[PDB]
Scaffold this active site. Sequence first.
Site, PDB file in Angstrom:
ATOM      1  N   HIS A 151       0.801  -1.223   0.000  1.00 22.85           N
ATOM      2  CA  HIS A 151       0.000   0.000   0.000  1.00 22.85           C
ATOM      3  C   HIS A 151       0.839   1.280   0.000  1.00 22.85           C
ATOM      4  O   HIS A 151       0.311   2.376   0.213  1.00 22.85           O
ATOM      5  CB  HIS A 151      -0.996  -0.010   1.163  1.00 22.85           C
ATOM      6  CG  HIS A 151      -2.235  -0.804   0.886  1.00 22.85           C
ATOM      7  ND1 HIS A 151      -2.209  -2.157   0.620  1.00 22.85           N
ATOM      8  CD2 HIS A 151      -3.536  -0.436   0.834  1.00 22.85           C
ATOM      9  CE1 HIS A 151      -3.441  -2.587   0.414  1.00 22.85           C
ATOM     10  NE2 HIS A 151      -4.266  -1.562   0.540  1.00 22.85           N
ATOM     11  N   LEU A 163      -2.714  -8.392  -9.588  1.00 28.66           N
ATOM     12  CA  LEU A 163      -2.080  -9.628  -9.137  1.00 28.66           C
ATOM     13  C   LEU A 163      -1.920  -9.701  -7.616  1.00 28.66           C
ATOM     14  O   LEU A 163      -2.014 -10.783  -7.030  1.00 28.66           O
ATOM     15  CB  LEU A 163      -0.720  -9.770  -9.834  1.00 28.66           C
ATOM     16  CG  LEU A 163       0.278 -10.897  -9.565  1.00 28.66           C
ATOM     17  CD1 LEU A 163       1.067 -11.185 -10.834  1.00 28.66           C
ATOM     18  CD2 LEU A 163       1.223 -10.561  -8.409  1.00 28.66           C
ATOM     19  N   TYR A 164      -1.690  -8.551  -6.986  1.00 26.76           N
ATOM     20  CA  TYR A 164      -1.353  -8.500  -5.561  1.00 26.76           C
ATOM     21  C   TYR A 164      -2.575  -8.413  -4.639  1.00 26.76           C
ATOM     22  O   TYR A 164      -2.438  -8.178  -3.435  1.00 26.76           O
ATOM     23  CB  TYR A 164      -0.399  -7.333  -5.281  1.00 26.76           C
ATOM     24  CG  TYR A 164       0.845  -7.716  -4.507  1.00 26.76           C
ATOM     25  CD1 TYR A 164       2.112  -7.431  -5.014  1.00 26.76           C
ATOM     26  CD2 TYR A 164       0.759  -8.368  -3.276  1.00 26.76           C
ATOM     27  CE1 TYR A 164       3.260  -7.776  -4.315  1.00 26.76           C
ATOM     28  CE2 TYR A 164       1.903  -8.718  -2.569  1.00 26.76           C
ATOM     29  CZ  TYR A 164       3.150  -8.418  -3.096  1.00 26.76           C
ATOM     30  OH  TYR A 164       4.286  -8.760  -2.403  1.00 26.76           O
TER      31      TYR A 164
HETATM   32  C1  HEM Z   1      -9.262  -7.500   6.426  1.00 27.22           C
HETATM   33  C2  HEM Z   1      -8.335  -6.770   5.795  1.00 27.22           C
HETATM   34  C3  HEM Z   1      -8.609  -6.205   4.380  1.00 27.22           C
HETATM   35  C4  HEM Z   1      -9.587  -5.355   4.037  1.00 27.22           C
HETATM   36  C5  HEM Z   1     -10.660  -4.746   4.973  1.00 27.22           C
HETATM   37  C6  HEM Z   1      -9.473  -5.095   2.616  1.00 27.22           C
HETATM   38  C7  HEM Z   1     -10.280  -4.276   1.860  1.00 27.22           C
HETATM   39  C8  HEM Z   1      -9.839  -3.498   0.815  1.00 27.22           C
HETATM   40  C9  HEM Z   1     -10.339  -2.190   0.436  1.00 27.22           C
HETATM   41  C10 HEM Z   1     -11.484  -1.425   1.149  1.00 27.22           C
HETATM   42  C11 HEM Z   1      -9.638  -1.778  -0.632  1.00 27.22           C
HETATM   43  C12 HEM Z   1      -9.812  -0.437  -1.389  1.00 27.22           C
HETATM   44  C13 HEM Z   1     -10.988  -0.493  -2.364  1.00 27.22           C
HETATM   45  C14 HEM Z   1     -10.729  -1.491  -3.465  1.00 27.22           C
HETATM   46  O1  HEM Z   1      -9.708  -1.347  -4.190  1.00 27.22           O
HETATM   47  O2  HEM Z   1     -11.551  -2.433  -3.615  1.00 27.22           O
HETATM   48  C15 HEM Z   1      -8.670  -2.813  -0.954  1.00 27.22           C
HETATM   49  C16 HEM Z   1      -7.750  -2.792  -1.981  1.00 27.22           C
HETATM   50  C17 HEM Z   1      -6.580  -3.517  -2.059  1.00 27.22           C
HETATM   51  N1  HEM Z   1      -6.205  -4.573  -1.230  1.00 27.22           N
HETATM   52 FE1  HEM Z   1      -7.308  -5.204   0.435  1.00 27.22          FE
HETATM   53  N2  HEM Z   1      -8.397  -5.810   2.131  1.00 27.22           N
HETATM   54  C18 HEM Z   1      -7.839  -6.508   3.185  1.00 27.22           C
HETATM   55  C19 HEM Z   1      -6.740  -7.341   3.084  1.00 27.22           C
HETATM   56  C20 HEM Z   1      -5.738  -7.239   2.137  1.00 27.22           C
HETATM   57  C21 HEM Z   1      -4.413  -7.829   2.211  1.00 27.22           C
HETATM   58  C22 HEM Z   1      -3.877  -8.694   3.376  1.00 27.22           C
HETATM   59  C23 HEM Z   1      -3.746  -7.492   1.096  1.00 27.22           C
HETATM   60  C24 HEM Z   1      -2.296  -7.886   0.731  1.00 27.22           C
HETATM   61  C25 HEM Z   1      -2.012  -9.111   0.282  1.00 27.22           C
HETATM   62  C26 HEM Z   1      -4.621  -6.677   0.275  1.00 27.22           C
HETATM   63  C27 HEM Z   1      -4.310  -6.132  -0.953  1.00 27.22           C
HETATM   64  C28 HEM Z   1      -4.955  -5.085  -1.580  1.00 27.22           C
HETATM   65  C29 HEM Z   1      -4.450  -4.341  -2.715  1.00 27.22           C
HETATM   66  C30 HEM Z   1      -3.109  -4.544  -3.458  1.00 27.22           C
HETATM   67  C31 HEM Z   1      -5.533  -3.298  -3.031  1.00 27.22           C
HETATM   68  C32 HEM Z   1      -5.509  -2.232  -4.148  1.00 27.22           C
HETATM   69  C33 HEM Z   1      -4.914  -0.944  -3.586  1.00 27.22           C
HETATM   70  C34 HEM Z   1      -5.073   0.195  -4.561  1.00 27.22           C
HETATM   71  O3  HEM Z   1      -5.114  -0.050  -5.795  1.00 27.22           O
HETATM   72  O4  HEM Z   1      -5.154   1.359  -4.100  1.00 27.22           O
HETATM   73  N3  HEM Z   1      -5.825  -6.546   0.940  1.00 27.22           N
HETATM   74  N4  HEM Z   1      -8.823  -3.846  -0.051  1.00 27.22           N
HETATM   75  O1  LIG Z   2       8.596 -10.603  -4.957  1.00 25.45           O
HETATM   76  C1  LIG Z   2       7.878 -10.126  -4.054  1.00 25.45           C
HETATM   77  O2  LIG Z   2       8.177  -9.093  -3.416  1.00 25.45           O
HETATM   78  C2  LIG Z   2       6.588 -10.828  -3.713  1.00 25.45           C
HETATM   79  C3  LIG Z   2       6.154 -11.712  -4.859  1.00 25.45           C
HETATM   80  C4  LIG Z   2       4.833 -11.677  -5.287  1.00 25.45           C
HETATM   81  C5  LIG Z   2       4.418 -12.487  -6.336  1.00 25.45           C
HETATM   82  C6  LIG Z   2       5.328 -13.333  -6.957  1.00 25.45           C
HETATM   83  C7  LIG Z   2       6.650 -13.367  -6.526  1.00 25.45           C
HETATM   84  C8  LIG Z   2       7.064 -12.555  -5.476  1.00 25.45           C
HETATM   85  N1  LIG Z   2       8.350 -12.593  -5.065  1.00 25.45           N
HETATM   86  C9  LIG Z   2       9.201 -13.508  -5.578  1.00 25.45           C
HETATM   87  C10 LIG Z   2      10.409 -13.108  -6.125  1.00 25.45           C
HETATM   88 CL1  LIG Z   2      10.855 -11.371  -6.162  1.00 25.45          CL
HETATM   89  C11 LIG Z   2      11.284 -14.052  -6.648  1.00 25.45           C
HETATM   90  C12 LIG Z   2      10.947 -15.400  -6.624  1.00 25.45           C
HETATM   91  C13 LIG Z   2       9.736 -15.800  -6.074  1.00 25.45           C
HETATM   92  C14 LIG Z   2       8.866 -14.851  -5.552  1.00 25.45           C
HETATM   93 CL2  LIG Z   2       7.302 -15.369  -4.840  1.00 25.45          CL
END
Ligand code: HEM
Ligand SMILES: O=C(O)Cc1ccccc1Nc1c(Cl)cccc1Cl
Lengths: 553, 553
Positions: free
Chosen positions: A176, A353-354
Amino acid sequence: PVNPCCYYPCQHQGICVRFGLDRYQCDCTRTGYSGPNCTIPEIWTWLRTTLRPSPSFIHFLLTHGRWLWDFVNATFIRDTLMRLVLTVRSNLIPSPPTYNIAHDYISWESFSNVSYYTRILPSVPRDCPTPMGTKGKKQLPDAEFLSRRFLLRRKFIPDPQGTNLMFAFFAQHFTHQFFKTSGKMGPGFTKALGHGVDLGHIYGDNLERQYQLRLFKDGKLKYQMLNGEVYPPSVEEAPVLMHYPRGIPPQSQMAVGQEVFGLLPGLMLYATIWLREHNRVCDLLKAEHPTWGDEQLFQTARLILIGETIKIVIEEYVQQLSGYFLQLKFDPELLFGAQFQYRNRIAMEFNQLYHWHPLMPDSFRVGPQDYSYEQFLFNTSMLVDYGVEALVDAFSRQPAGRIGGGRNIDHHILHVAVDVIKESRVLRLQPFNEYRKRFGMKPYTSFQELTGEKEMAAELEELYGDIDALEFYPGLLLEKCHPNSIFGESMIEMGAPFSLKGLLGNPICSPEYWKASTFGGEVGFNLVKTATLKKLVCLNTKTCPYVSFHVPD
Amino acid sequence: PVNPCCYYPCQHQGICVRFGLDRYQCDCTRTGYSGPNCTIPEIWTWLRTTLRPSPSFIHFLLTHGRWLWDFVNATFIRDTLMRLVLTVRSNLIPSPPTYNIAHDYISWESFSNVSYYTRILPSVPRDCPTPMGTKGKKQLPDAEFLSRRFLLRRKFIPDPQGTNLMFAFFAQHFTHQFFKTSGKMGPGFTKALGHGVDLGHIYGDNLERQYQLRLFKDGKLKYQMLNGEVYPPSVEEAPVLMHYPRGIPPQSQMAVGQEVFGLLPGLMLYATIWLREHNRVCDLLKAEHPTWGDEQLFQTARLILIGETIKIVIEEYVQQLSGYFLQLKFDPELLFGAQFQYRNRIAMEFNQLYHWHPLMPDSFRVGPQDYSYEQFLFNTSMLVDYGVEALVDAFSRQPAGRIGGGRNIDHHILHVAVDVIKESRVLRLQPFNEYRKRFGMKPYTSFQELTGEKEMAAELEELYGDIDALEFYPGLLLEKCHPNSIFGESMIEMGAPFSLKGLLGNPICSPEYWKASTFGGEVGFNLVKTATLKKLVCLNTKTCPYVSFHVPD
Ligand code: HEM
Ligand SMILES: O=C(O)Cc1ccccc1Nc1c(Cl)cccc1Cl
Ligand SMILES: *[C@@H]1O[C@H](CO)[C@@H](O[C@H]2O[C@H](CO)[C@@H](O[C@@H]3O[C@H](CO[C@H]4O[C@H](CO[C@H]5O[C@H](CO)[C@@H](O)[C@H](O)[C@@H]5O)[C@@H](O)[C@H](O)[C@@H]4O)[C@@H](O)[C@H](O)[C@@H]3O)[C@H](O)[C@H]2NC(C)=O)[C@H](O)[C@H]1NC(C)=O
Ligand SMILES: *[C@@H]1O[C@H](CO)[C@@H](O[C@@H]2O[C@H](CO)[C@@H](O[C@@H]3O[C@H](CO[C@@H]4O[C@H](CO)[C@@H](O)[C@H](O)[C@@H]4O)[C@@H](O)[C@H](O)[C@@H]3O)[C@H](O)[C@H]2NC(C)=O)[C@H](O)[C@H]1NC(C)=O
Ligand SMILES: *[C@@H]1O[C@H](CO)[C@@H](O[C@@H]2O[C@H](CO)[C@@H](O[C@@H]3O[C@H](CO[C@@H]4O[C@H](CO)[C@@H](O)[C@H](O)[C@@H]4O)[C@@H](O)[C@H](O)[C@@H]3O)[C@H](O)[C@H]2NC(C)=O)[C@H](O)[C@H]1NC(C)=O
Ligand SMILES: *[C@@H]1O[C@H](CO)[C@@H](O[C@H]2O[C@H](CO)[C@@H](O[C@@H]3O[C@H](CO[C@@H]4O[C@H](CO)[C@@H](O)[C@H](O)[C@@H]4O)[C@@H](O)[C@H](O)[C@@H]3O)[C@H](O)[C@H]2NC(C)=O)[C@H](O)[C@H]1NC(C)=O
Ligand code: HEM
Ligand SMILES: *[C@@H]1O[C@H](CO)[C@@H](O[C@H]2O[C@H](CO)[C@@H](O)[C@H](O)[C@H]2NC(C)=O)[C@H](O)[C@H]1NC(C)=O
Ligand SMILES: CCCCCCCCO[C@@H]1O[C@H](CO)[C@@H](O)[C@H](O)[C@H]1O
Ligand SMILES: CCCCCCCCO[C@@H]1O[C@H](CO)[C@@H](O)[C@H](O)[C@H]1O
Ligand SMILES: CCCCCCCCO[C@@H]1O[C@H](CO)[C@@H](O)[C@H](O)[C@H]1O
Ligand SMILES: CCCCCCCCO[C@@H]1O[C@H](CO)[C@@H](O)[C@H](O)[C@H]1O
Ligand SMILES: O=C(O)Cc1ccccc1Nc1c(Cl)cccc1Cl
């Protein structure tokens, strides 16, 4: 007339350029291929492809045979393979960046305007018969129905890799800082203009926010003392935009770099930990340089903490995730004899992807208590109530959900995945099979080969119509998983290239920046080189609890 | 306590870092040296220094012997030497950039905030005994008195290389796209956020301005018709901020990318040609791609015009002032097998250096007419009255002034040189000799060694006291110029690294960008590859005048 580029006729990173009224041409420059569609291989490319082992074979080798890897890690081969891992992966990402939401072609606006997310593959042209190109139906499957039938958790499927919530919240906190999609500008636009590990989720994406967060003495950040423990400051002390539920008292509102961190105790946990680390580093810097001003103490401390992050991300975070027997190493000097670009632009596909929301469980167990989503979300007291020590221990002992496989997103946060698929059609991402080819993999010939089973494949065969129509995000979370792994084969092959280019593309990894003086001498340089997740927590706390990216046993 | 870094102890790019109360440490990392001051060389460093010919000896080789260079230019040795000039020069420049006005140390702020000019050598610390470090007087010689005695033109001294005003106006036009000092933010700040050859002096430094110049039809820029000829549009039609003298309404003003261009007809002359070029390129691209929208036609034309700029600059512009018999070549492919960062940040030293106001004559001649400064400056009708052909012919036939040697700045524009020195003291630029060392040259031991004569050397010795107290800008202009040249030894050795890192560091020169598709096929790729000063002018005019960077024989 029909746009010929809808068929994706160019192969192996060739560029479809529309000529005349109906014709097209592929620019096969430095692709290693020749011919109208870039399919006729050059002498070196043909030799390399027949001698190239499959992506699964390489993953098999990296995950098996400890006797070989105990040997490899204690030798020079560790550094040789790591360099190979760095170079081969990161070269799959264009640098300087190519396309964005506005331009499916190279332009100066796509290079200079950093408010854009970049993209590896161009968008599906708006004049194509189907929204995914040519294959499939006119209407893509309902985003609510696709999430309900295939993504909705019916039973908690734990991750076999032993991943915990400590990892999950680290993943969310760390990402984030470069995933800050703009609400006003819309999808495909970003607010995190640093495009990588800048730590703007601790310091702020803009200068005035940083200045407001800074104590302006000894380089430190502002902080408040609650129960003898150091925590982020209140909104009164640091008047910055923070997303909190309206009506909540300002005394309960904490102020950090990223606006959304106050909504989760797991996020504000790391915000506290990193803030304690910043000021701790300032204390070490001040003892080393008492003649230094406030500004230098701050900036030098930021770069140390940037270096500490990348160190922990590669050597522990990626170590747990990939499950490699190869001991990963953060050493920028590996790329010092290679052609590498020390810049990064965040891609929309890396954003998509993330989205590892399957990582979250059914509840949040802290000691003898079990906290529900409604008890955990938007809770402004839990962090102060238990403290860093008690929460870090609680998150390191609770298992996290499996990302790949399917049917593993808790219903409370399922709406996110629905919006992600919705965002994918607005951005007009190409089909999953097209990205498979872009990252050096063979496309799936059927849905049965994708999921590896008969049941869930048959329903997807009816909905999409064709495998070449399957969307990006649903493909990554429905792909068959090798037992013991956290997700499918594609996640590694698509994600790693981005991730490594983000880490090692940081300017501090450059020959110009990777010096002792950059981090205020040997004391600061060693803090980067020896940084650990354990040392990130326990050195900033009274006692040392169990802290790891994996659960005990 | 006395600042140890005021002595500039760390040699060969070593970094002085403050420790404790009165101590310092040099970071000798990757300098090629070790020890307390980075003075003892490594085995490979000692080898290089002893076998390395003097800067003036290699300059001698490049400017002598026609018969040897005829052979070289017809063989691959032309490409071999050009690659060497590219690599060895530009590596003297820190990439990514290091310091700025705010920080005399590496920081993330210095890296991310592109509103700053960068710098190569850190400033003179505020707590130094003398303004130039430890040498000279407490009060630095008067700025106006220094310009009046050593820089003020008595008799006009033309360039012995036969450089014309067509070159001089190109110089001022070309530089003002990356030299745009923010008067509101102050010295060391820049509005030219492209930090290179972006053509923001044609399209604009910001997006909202660019959109005003554009027609949004066929990818073209707006234009007005006067005397059956294409010219830049009025500010009434394209409402953009232009710096015109008070009392002149937008009805007479002309709208271009750079705000200060209305003040000089020579600048507006080059604004017209490139505008005619842009729209001429749009026409060619429209025939190849009739299905392209406005946005793709505009952006692709910009990349071509960028490509054409770097082409002409290297093979003709640089060819003229360098006086090399080696045929210079623009080929980005020369760097594909090298370690090269495709990024550039404009340094304040390059800004100071490029103040080539000596180039300007006593009066401007247009055929039988002789216009003075009062008639020429702020003139709004001269361009329209004569046309492009007539003024191109005039500026190409009139000789420009010699930059080096001193006493060759016209009294009308001498106040600029006063402000350059005054800005240098605010920026706290290091002594000339310190910059000599930084660009691989021996520091001058006396003023007599610098000048080549006796009179001006003794008076400067009285004003400065010590040779190590001599400033950057005055040192460049009062230096001895080798055999019949534009300027002294230092101007090449200091400016060339800045220029080549600025030119070849452009993203279009990267393997990712340097394709035919980026310029819309081979037609757009050839326009870059075959670009010429003559082809820039005569293809955009009805008749072809004398067009060159040098006067006729
Ligand atoms: C219970 C905890 C979590 C809540 C309440 C939640 C909810 C949300 C919300 C409200 C958003 C912003 C609106 C949207 O893009 O749909 C979001 C986006 C996102 N979330 Fe989560 N999520 C959670 C857990 C996670 C975790 C653990 C990850 C990491 C692996 C993650 C990754 C992401 C990513 C990468 C975005 C897009 C951010 C952006 O483009 O600004 N989330 N999620
Ligand atoms: O690389 C990261 O920081 C997290 C991540 C997310 C998705 C896929 C790969 C990776 N990392 C990663 C890398 Cl950088 C190399 C070998 C294997 C993995 Cl899982
Ligand atoms: C790249 O970098 C440049 C230079 O750093 C930068 O230019 C500007 O940077 C900032 C603004 O972004 C300007 O800062 C000036 O300094 C004073 C600081 O004094 C006090 O500031 C606080 C008072 O203001 C606030 O009051 C209350 C809280 O106290 C708050 O609620 C208000 O909202 C208000 O903001 C005070 O808290 C603190 O303790 C200090 O005593 C600022 O007040 C003011 O903004 C000044 O202008 C610089 O002057 C700007 N220019 C220059 C040349 O330095 C660029 O913005 C940056 N570019 C990018 C893209 O990031
Ligand atoms: C934000 O999170 C904080 C976490 O600190 C919440 O504060 C805590 O809230 C609990 C109520 O859930 C307070 O009381 C505690 O809870 C137990 C509940 O009984 C227990 O339940 C199990 C299973 O049902 C049974 O086997 C047992 O009966 C078991 O005891 C209660 O019995 C105790 O009184 C216990 O203290 C807790 O005191 C409080 N924490 C602090 C430090 O005050 C908070 O509610 C939450 N906020 C929001 C808005 O959701
Ligand atoms: C902005 O530029 C325009 C040019 O486009 C200026 O207008 C021009 O001004 C000149 C005078 O500066 C006009 O010249 C006229 O023609 C002759 C010139 O004399 C001749 O040349 C030399 C030297 O003067 C003499 O030795 C010869 O004997 C010969 O006579 C003269 O007879 C006229 O009196 C007049 O000077 C030119 O015609 C004019 N062009 C136009 C289109 O009007 C304009 O002044 C300038 N703006 C400002 C504020 O100076
Ligand atoms: C990076 O790029 C982003 C997207 O291009 C920029 O975002 C913003 O800038 C856009 C262009 O300035 C904004 O677009 C709007 O366009 C409408 C259209 O009106 C038209 O322009 C003129 C209006 O004066 C008229 O003459 C003409 O006839 C026509 O009607 C206009 O009404 C708006 O005023 C605005 O210009 C857009 O709002 C905005 N966001 C997005 C998501 O597009 C960024 O500025 C850019 N960033 C940087 C640092 O350069
Ligand atoms: C008679 C013609 C010229 C005029 C009237 C002129 C005018 C000016 C003025 C008013 C300034 C700002 C000075 C200040 O207030 O600090 C300036 C700066 C400058 N001059 Fe010129 N100049 C002329 C020719 C040239 C030429 C031929 C060059 C060679 C390239 C040149 C190079 C520069 C540069 C690089 C700057 C600094 C730009 C910036 O950072 O804003 N000038 N000039
Ligand atoms: C060039 O690539 C195209 C990809 O579209 C291939 O397919 C084209 O040519 C076929 C044989 O002439 C036709 O049957 C297809 O209709 C046509 N495709 C489209 C979309 O019109 C073609 O085989 C490739 N050419 C070669 C020589 O391999
Ligand atoms: C192309 C020549 C390179 C040799 C590749 C050998 C084929 C790899 O076969 C691999 O075997 C592994 C178990 O042994 C499996 O886990 C993989 O799924 C499979 O791809
Ligand atoms: C025996 C272990 C060798 C590991 C070194 C190889 C690491 C490079 O990883 C390779 O990257 C490519 C681009 O992402 C992919 O196409 C390959 O499938 C992948 O294995
Ligand atoms: C012992 C090995 C040393 C031979 C390599 C000498 C290379 C330096 O080059 C020398 O530069 C001088 C200019 O200062 C010229 O006078 C000499 O002619 C030239 O050989
Ligand atoms: C003691 C050795 C350090 C002095 C270095 C001076 C080397 C000669 O000067 C060289 O001139 C060449 C002209 O083509 C350029 O390629 C080099 O960049 C420049 O350093
Ligand atoms: O390239 C330019 O902008 C002109 C310029 C200005 C200052 C110093 C050098 C140069 N050009 C130049 C270069 Cl880039 C290389 C070799 C010789 C010369 Cl004169």
